[PDB]
Amino acid sequence: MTWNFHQYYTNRNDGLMGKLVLTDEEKNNLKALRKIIRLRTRDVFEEAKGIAKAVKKSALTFEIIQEKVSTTQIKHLSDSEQREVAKLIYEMDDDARDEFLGLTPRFWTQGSFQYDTLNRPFQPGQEMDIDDGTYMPMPIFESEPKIGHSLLILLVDASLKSLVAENHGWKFEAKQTCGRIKIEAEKTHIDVPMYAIPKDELDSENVNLALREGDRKWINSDPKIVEDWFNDSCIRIGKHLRKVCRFMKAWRDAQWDVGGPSSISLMAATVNILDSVAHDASDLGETMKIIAKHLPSEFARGVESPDSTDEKPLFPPSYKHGPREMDIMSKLERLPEILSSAESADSKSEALKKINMAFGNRVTNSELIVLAK
Ligand SMILES: CN1c2c([nH]c(N)nc2=O)NC[C@@H]1CNc1ccc(C(=O)N[C@@H](CCC(=O)N[C@@H](CCC(=O)O)C(=O)O)C(=O)O)cc1
Ligand SMILES: [Mg+2]
């Protein structure tokens, strides 16, 4: 009794991959959602820039500026927020207004869904986490850019909130790093962080994330850093990297209804292990056992972000562990034992049941599990 699980994992119909990967349709529906947001955000900025251009032509009273604001999509903000938008437009200097009039919101063409490892949600209440940033090409700024933090966030909020008003089942929720649209019926939420970038390329640093609460209004955070890291890793290691990342993310979804380690911490740890430990990429069952064996050590040490400019660990080191991190360490230690137990189970039926204690009950096809060669 030594069971092989390579097809349990990799089978694109009945295997774990077949249960995790979104259909071409479901993917296109997320793309459609994403497109609706981007269009509305662009539309809102035009409406606002429309008012700004009228002010450049003639400096209107605040009352007239406010009336114009009130009949834009910005009408979906509160009264005080509309006043604030109208006041910011009223207060613009010539230099600032010309900047604003040249600003159109930008979106990332290279962005995939979770580095192309977005899994179908497993447990009831679990939702797909989709991020689509809005990039604001502006002059490089020291503290604050000509176009203010406040105005930009208000306009993005107006965009998201105006969509929420026109679409039943949608809700808005403001977060630290982003505005969020939650669509519970579609088990989906999409986060719209807002970044400031240089007008002329020059993209290394000076990607600035807008923070909604607190003293710092902007922080340096370039999502391209982690994206490049991971894409390069997949090239260096092989096509199985994304698969094993999907599997660990699925394991996480199965072990915790809410909570568990971040997907990125699992990706960083998995990459570290596959770079440093011999494995056979032709057997994902053997490969997963190798990953399972080494994860506890990766997490115990704390998981460093692949972005060297991020001082905060993706997962805390052992000495900073509370009940939640202790819980996570505990399940990580169980994982390699679960995989070995499945491997030596009495039957196909039992082997499936045991491995499904790691990844949840999804795969129903025991025939994917085969007697070892
Ligand atoms: C890559 N980048 C980069 C960054 N950082 C670093 N460190 N290195 C980098 O290389 N960050 C940002 C930078 C972004 N590059 C971009 C360049 C252009 C665009 C862009 O979306 N342009 C259009 C969008 C409108 C549209 O197409 N509308 C469509 C539909 C819009 C839709 O839904 O998609 C229409 O006509 O209807 C525009 O100019 O308005 C988006 C991103
Ligand atoms: Mg998100």
Curated annotation (Swiss-Prot):
E.C. number: 2.7.7.-
Keywords: Antiviral defense, ATP-binding, GTP-binding, Isopeptide bond, Magnesium, Metal-binding, Nucleotide metabolism, Nucleotide-binding, Nucleotidyltransferase, Transferase, Virulence
GO biological process per UniProt: cyclic nucleotide biosynthetic process; defense response to virus; negative regulation of chemotaxis
One matching Pfam family: DncV_C
Keyword Nucleotide-binding listed: yes
Catalyzed reactions per annotation: GTP + ATP = 3',3'-cGAMP + 2 diphosphate
Binding sites annotated in the UniProt record for ATP: R180, S221
Co-factor requirement: Mg(2+)
Stated regulation of activity: Primed for activation by Cap2 which conjugates it to cellular proteins; priming is target protein-specific (green fluorescent protein does not activate the enzyme), but which protein(s) activate is unclear. Enzymatic activity of DncV is inhibited by folate-like molecules, such as 5-methyltetrahydrofolate di-glutamate and 5-methyltetrahydrofolate, suggesting the existence of a signaling pathway that links folate-like metabolism cofactors to the regulation of cyclic dinucleotide second messenger synthesis. Lacks a regulatory loop and is constitutively activated.
Induction (record text): Expression is repressed by the transcriptional regulator VspR. Part of a CBASS operon consisting of capV-dncV-cap2-cap3.
Uppermost EC category: transferase
Binding site for Mg(2+): D129, D131, D191
Chain spans, region Disordered: 301-320
Consequence when changing Q110T: Abolishes enzyme activity
Cofactor binding, note field: Binds 1 Mg(2+) ion per subunit.
Post-translational modification: In bacteria expressing capV-cdnD-cap2, this protein is conjugated to a number of other proteins (by Cap2 via this protein's C-terminal Gly residue), many of which are involved in metabolism. More conjugated protein is found in the absence of Cap3.
GO molecular function terms noted in the UniProt entry: 3',3'-cyclic GMP-AMP synthase activity; ATP binding; diguanylate cyclase activity; GTP binding; metal ion binding
Family: Belongs to the CD-NTase family. A01 subfamily.
Subunit structure: Monomer. Interacts with Cap2 in the presence and absence of phage T2. A Cap2 dimer is bound on either side by a DncV monomer.
Protein function: Cyclic nucleotide synthase (second messenger synthase) of a CBASS antivirus system. CBASS (cyclic oligonucleotide-based antiphage signaling system) provides immunity against bacteriophages. The CD-NTase protein (DncV, this protein) synthesizes cyclic nucleotides in response to infection; these serve as specific second messenger signals. The signals activate a diverse range of effectors, leading to bacterial cell death and thus abortive phage infection. A type II-A(GA) CBASS system.
Additional comment: Overproduction of the cGAMP synthase DncV leads to an increase in intracellular cGAMP, and induces the formation of cells more translucent than normal with a defect in cell membrane integrity, planktonic growth arrest and a small colony phenotype in El Tor V.cholerae.
Name of the protein in question: Cyclic GMP-AMP synthase
Organism: Vibrio cholerae serotype O1 (strain ATCC 39315 / El Tor Inaba N16961)
Lineage, highest ranks first: Bacteria, Pseudomonadati, Pseudomonadota, Gammaproteobacteria, Vibrionales
